[PDB]
Amino acid sequence: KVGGNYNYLYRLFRKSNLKPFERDISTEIYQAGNKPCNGVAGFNCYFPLRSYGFRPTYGVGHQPYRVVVLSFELLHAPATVCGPKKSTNLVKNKCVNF
Amino acid sequence: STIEEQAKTFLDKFNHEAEDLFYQSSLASWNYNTNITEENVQNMNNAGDKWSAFLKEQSTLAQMYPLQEIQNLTVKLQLQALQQNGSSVLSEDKSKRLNTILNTMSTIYSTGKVCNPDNPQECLLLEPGLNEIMANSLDYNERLWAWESWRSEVGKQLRPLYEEYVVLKNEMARANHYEDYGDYWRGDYEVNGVDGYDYSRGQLIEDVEHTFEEIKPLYEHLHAYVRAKLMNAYPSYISPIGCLPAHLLGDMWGRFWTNLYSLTVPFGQKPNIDVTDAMVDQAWDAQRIFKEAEKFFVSVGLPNMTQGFWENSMLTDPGNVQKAVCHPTAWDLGKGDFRILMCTKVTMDDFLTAHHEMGHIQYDMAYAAQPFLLRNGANEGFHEAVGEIMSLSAATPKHLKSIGLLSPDFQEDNETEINFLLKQALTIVGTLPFTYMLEKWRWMVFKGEIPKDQWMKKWWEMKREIVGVVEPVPHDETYCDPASLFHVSNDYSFIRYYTRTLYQFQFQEALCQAAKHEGPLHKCDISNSTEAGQKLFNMLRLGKSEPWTLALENVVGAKNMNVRPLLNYFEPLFTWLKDQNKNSFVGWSTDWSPY
Amino acid sequence: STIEEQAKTFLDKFNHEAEDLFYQSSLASWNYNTNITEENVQNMNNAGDKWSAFLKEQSTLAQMYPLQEIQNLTVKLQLQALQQNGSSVLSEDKSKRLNTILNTMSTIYSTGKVCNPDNPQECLLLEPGLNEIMANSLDYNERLWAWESWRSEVGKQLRPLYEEYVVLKNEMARANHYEDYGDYWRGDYEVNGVDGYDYSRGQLIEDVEHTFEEIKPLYEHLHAYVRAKLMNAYPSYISPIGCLPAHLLGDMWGRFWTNLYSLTVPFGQKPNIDVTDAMVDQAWDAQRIFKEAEKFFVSVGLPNMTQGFWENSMLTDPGNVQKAVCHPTAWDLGKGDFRILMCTKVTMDDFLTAHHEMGHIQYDMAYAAQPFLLRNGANEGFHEAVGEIMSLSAATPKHLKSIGLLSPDFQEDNETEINFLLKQALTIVGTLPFTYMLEKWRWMVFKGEIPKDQWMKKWWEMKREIVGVVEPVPHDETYCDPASLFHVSNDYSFIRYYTRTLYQFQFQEALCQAAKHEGPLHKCDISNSTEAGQKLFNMLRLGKSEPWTLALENVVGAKNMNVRPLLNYFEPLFTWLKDQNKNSFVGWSTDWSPY
Ligand SMILES: *[C@@H]1O[C@H](CO)[C@@H](O)[C@H](O)[C@H]1NC(C)=O
Ligand SMILES: *[C@@H]1O[C@H](CO)[C@@H](O)[C@H](O)[C@H]1NC(C)=O
Ligand SMILES: *[C@@H]1O[C@H](CO)[C@@H](O)[C@H](O)[C@H]1NC(C)=O
Ligand SMILES: *[C@@H]1O[C@H](CO)[C@@H](O)[C@H](O)[C@H]1NC(C)=O
Ligand SMILES: [Cl-]
Numbered sequence A: 001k002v003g004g005n006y007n008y009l010y011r012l013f014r015k016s017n018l019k020p021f022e023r024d025i026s027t028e029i030y031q032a033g034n035k036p037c038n039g040v041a042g043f044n045c046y047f048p049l050r051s052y053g054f055r056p057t058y059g060v061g062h063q064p065y066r067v068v069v070l071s072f073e074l075l076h077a078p079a080t081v082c083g084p085k086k087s088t089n090l091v092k093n094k095c096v097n098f
Numbered sequence B, C: 001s002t003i004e005e006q007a008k009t010f011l012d013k014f015n016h017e018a019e020d021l022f023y024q025s026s027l028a029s030w031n032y033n034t035n036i037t038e039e040n041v042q043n044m045n046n047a048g049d050k051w052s053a054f055l056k057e058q059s060t061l062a063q064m065y066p067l068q069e070i071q072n073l074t075v076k077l078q079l080q081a082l083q084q085n086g087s088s089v090l091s092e093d094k095s096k097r098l099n100t101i102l103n104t105m106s107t108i109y110s111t112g113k114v115c116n117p118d119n120p121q122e123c124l125l126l127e128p129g130l131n132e133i134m135a136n137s138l139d140y141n142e143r144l145w146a147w148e149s150w151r152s153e154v155g156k157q158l159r160p161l162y163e164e165y166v167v168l169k170n171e172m173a174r175a176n177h178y179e180d181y182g183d184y185w186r187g188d189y190e191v192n193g194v195d196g197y198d199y200s201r202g203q204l205i206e207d208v209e210h211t212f213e214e215i216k217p218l219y220e221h222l223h224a225y226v227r228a229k230l231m232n233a234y235p236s237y238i239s240p241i242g243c244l245p246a247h248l249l250g251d252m253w254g255r256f257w258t259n260l261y262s263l264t265v266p267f268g269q270k271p272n273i274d275v276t277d278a279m280v281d282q283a284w285d286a287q288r289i290f291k292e293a294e295k296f297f298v299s300v301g302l303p304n305m306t307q308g309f310w311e312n313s314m315l316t317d318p319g320n321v322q323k324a325v326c327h328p329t330a331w332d333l334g335k336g337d338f339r340i341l342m343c344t345k346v347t348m349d350d351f352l353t354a355h356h357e358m359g360h361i362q363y364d365m366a367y368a369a370q371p372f373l374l375r376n377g378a379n380e381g382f383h384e385a386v387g388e389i390m391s392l393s394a395a396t397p398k399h400l401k402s403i404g405l406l407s408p409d410f411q412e413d414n415e416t417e418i419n420f421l422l423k424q425a426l427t428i429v430g431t432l433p434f435t436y437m438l439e440k441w442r443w444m445v446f447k448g449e450i451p452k453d454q455w456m457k458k459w460w461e462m463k464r465e466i467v468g469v470v471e472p473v474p475h476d477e478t479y480c481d482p483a484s485l486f487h488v489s490n491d492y493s494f495i496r497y498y499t500r501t502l503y504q505f506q507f508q509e510a511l512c513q514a515a516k517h518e519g520p521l522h523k524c525d526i527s528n529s530t531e532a533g534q535k536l537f538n539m540l541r542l543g544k545s546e547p548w549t550l551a552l553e554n555v556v557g558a559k560n561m562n563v564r565p566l567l568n569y570f571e572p573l574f575t576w577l578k579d580q581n582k583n584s585f586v587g588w589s590t591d592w593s594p595y
């Protein structure tokens, strides 16, 4: 938006790296100093999530990019996940391969 | 967690927030400049105050790190650029006093108007009218009176303010663990913490004096030639062996001698190389000029401009309905947003200025991947040098005839070459002594080597000795000639125009070697030279993340400033002047004066 | 094979043999202490002499390594701890003289007995009788005469010995590449060879002075309060604005003000928290107390005591048929053998002392996996601090009511809290100035800044200035008050009781943050705090294999000593004193004296 889309947030500080396919909604104050800060935003105690503020005047490097990951793996129960199987026509009075 | 991790986290947070807020502020300032309206003015104002308050509070929070335990040179430099207390070190009273002094200085210089004895209602201000006279007036008395009255009116009122500003800045910088404000200014070239590339503030003065020692001969011969040529235009006023008056340099302060080409033209029968009429015949416009500059820059091997550049940048005056500042400006709004504001007309001057602005934007884009506190040039002079090398390489006849501006049925000759070299020397090497003496006088004043009761005396003596410009009439000590200049009264460093003027030729001579040049340095063109383009980009990419000496070594191969390329550029002009500067005694006698 | 391999092999062999021999010696000493008999005495004697001779010959063999080519910090520290020549550097004559001087000093201090003019056969020695008087006597003249006579009898005889001991130790330490014996003592806190954690001997004095600069206000107010309260008990002898006599501090030397609680009790109507009678009603014993301490320690996350502890340790006096020293002692015999010797009675004091000894044994077991030369605390003060933090956390009302000692029908109030805080300040912060001034005087004497003819004068002046304790009567220079103390005449460092007193609160405040405390620091309990226990064990495990600064950083997060936790502990008491210390002028005038 011309005024900046601040609805998209991203994590900037975390105690450790996330595991594969891990999801963390925690919004606790990241302890960057020595004391716990008692859960207040101040010096050496920063909020983990930061905003983006996408604008139409940003450069290609900073413009927003919608990313998706459809992701397909293997187990036991047979599945209905199977591509469309197409079709042909129906001929009669001639031996063909069906 | 050691202090290093805290510093890194704070620097990342500051990078993000300052990038956002600086983009906001630059966008507001661009909206104001491109459209002068009260709403855009308010937007610029509130954005600027919020950004400045954010920066101040961040610097206050940054001072909580000792900075001696840290070892990462990058974080160290970021903190140094962000931990500088600045003017807040002095008590609030001194702060208010210095702010008021600066404001009144700037306003008196801007709102200065001189009344004249010709008519009780014939006052003219500085920018219009007075500059027209000082540039085109051929009458001795007229320009003399104007040059004397402007000073007697502005410097006499600014002297009580300068007497306060000098001491205030001295007490401010000294509180910052410096020697004086002159030393605080020299801190830009300070390099520490990296052996083999370090550079102290005190070495700058010595190196500048060493370079001027080699600049002197060429300037001496140029001054002798200009004097010998001015005797016919201003007879009965100039000496054969004496210095030159201050009101015959072509401008109010004599900073540039461009206005003297009309009088000191070696061969005025043949006109200079001008492609103005050749552009209108081909129906050229701002879009075409900028696209040609783009093709030239990419031919050297640099990336193409951003899509938003051609979309958001205003390259032509829409008329007096969307009023904007007509000054050529490069706008790096940040976050990949780059624009150029310029009222591009169909003229060779506009062509060169567009090339300069495009080179500046290319430099800005080079270090775009660096932190916010390091998204800047190596020093105050590298940016303008990188911008001027492009205009130099573009103004060559070969480049003008390769893109279709100059007709192929025209081969350059020695006469036009000498004319162009001399006209370039009027502004490149003709202004080096002025800048050098001004900076030396300012440094000596800030250090206290010149007592308060010897300011103007020492100023005029240094002028006579270095620049060879004598005072037209006796000046009382209540005068203040240095304050009459914009950069002096507005508290702006002036040494950048000297170090940058040298870096320009240092880069020009460093890129010609890569292009396999085979002629004089003034005929070099870096076009179609991929190796030179890559060598330059390898330095522009660094920006401020590395010392300026290391950056200079990447392109020129030298760790320290060098002026030999400057002399090599004007070597043919130097030989021509030496061959012509034998009809009279070369040099000037400082003891002689026109009064 | 480089010198490093030889050093490693020698260190392994020495580790094995010294472990064996030190276990033998500790076993002999334990058999002696637990049973005072001539046979056990002979066993202790021969074991000790053989162990000392082995150590001396090993150190002699260890000196064959230059120690400059080695790079392993562990082997370096082991050699430094084993290569110290010690007293053998001086010639044998000086060795015999210093040994005789030390022996006669110790014996004269121990065998010192004062005859009195009350009766020709009414002499009483120091430990019994004299301490009883100095603690419980309310008569001015009695305690004054006792305090004067003990000094006049002991210091006057020790002064000729101290005049020799000082110079002998100075010539001994100086031969060891040190400045003086005072600097040799400060070598314990010396950290070198590791940038970022190094610590020089000279920085200790500066840091101690900086910490005392912050300790002063609280001590000033405490002294003012004690003085204002003593005016009623000792009228006609104390000044409103002057210092306090030396014989009204509650002990022979005033090291601790515990005996002044009976006189300076804020609210004597309510008795202090005492669980003595509550223990006998539940049929408590040494076994139960030690098992409760075990459950408390394991609740924090520390390992359980060894099986041999409950089997080999003697926790209760078997009576006067197996006579033993009744002093609370922690015995680390080595090779996984740990025991505690204490005549545990049914009393809160015994409870706290057992907690302290169990904490000491836990610390000893922490670094059990380290070499013999590194099986020790970070410094001389870390062990006692780790032992005292446990007694502090255990004496809280919440802990006493959680284990069943304090009745649940009792909620603490502000009166008892203030009483307990003040009674703790009488011994924790009330003794810090004494230790500080004593150590400073000893350092200045060893360095030679105090001439021989100004010892007692400077001592009394420093006392008046720092501790605010004036001399009761004029003292001639033949007196020796410092030698009257055990730690001074017996050649024992005294700064440990200051650095340790600060490390105590540094750890207390560092562990409360992990336990998520929500109240004052004096109410914190590390019980059931697994994170605090693990953070502490991560430091106790290091022992001496790492610098003491790095160890302090592991728990407290700071590289250097800090006293702010000490002030935070007594912050409520400080506010209460400030509110009460307004009826008279705070401070003392050193110019006033009772004579
Ligand atoms: C210095 O900072 C850079 C960039 O953040 C980081 O990649 C690097 O690990 C740092 N090095 C040190 C020595 O801290
Ligand atoms: C660069 O190459 C272009 C394309 O052939 C050519 O027109 C031009 O002459 C070249 N420029 C120079 C001067 O090298
Ligand atoms: C230092 O000594 C220890 C114990 O002998 C050994 O484990 C370590 O590898 C040594 N380090 C070096 C590189 O000498
Ligand atoms: C520790 O845990 C035990 C068992 O839950 C509890 O009885 C005791 O009160 C706790 N102590 C404290 C004060 O944390
Ligand atoms: Cl001037």
Ligand SMILES: [Cl-]
Pocket: C246, C253, C481, C482
């Ligand atoms: Cl004493």
Ligand SMILES: [Zn+2]
Pocket: B356, B360, B384, B387
């Ligand atoms: Zn420019």
Ligand SMILES: [Zn+2]
Pocket: C356, C360, C384, C387
């Ligand atoms: Zn102990």
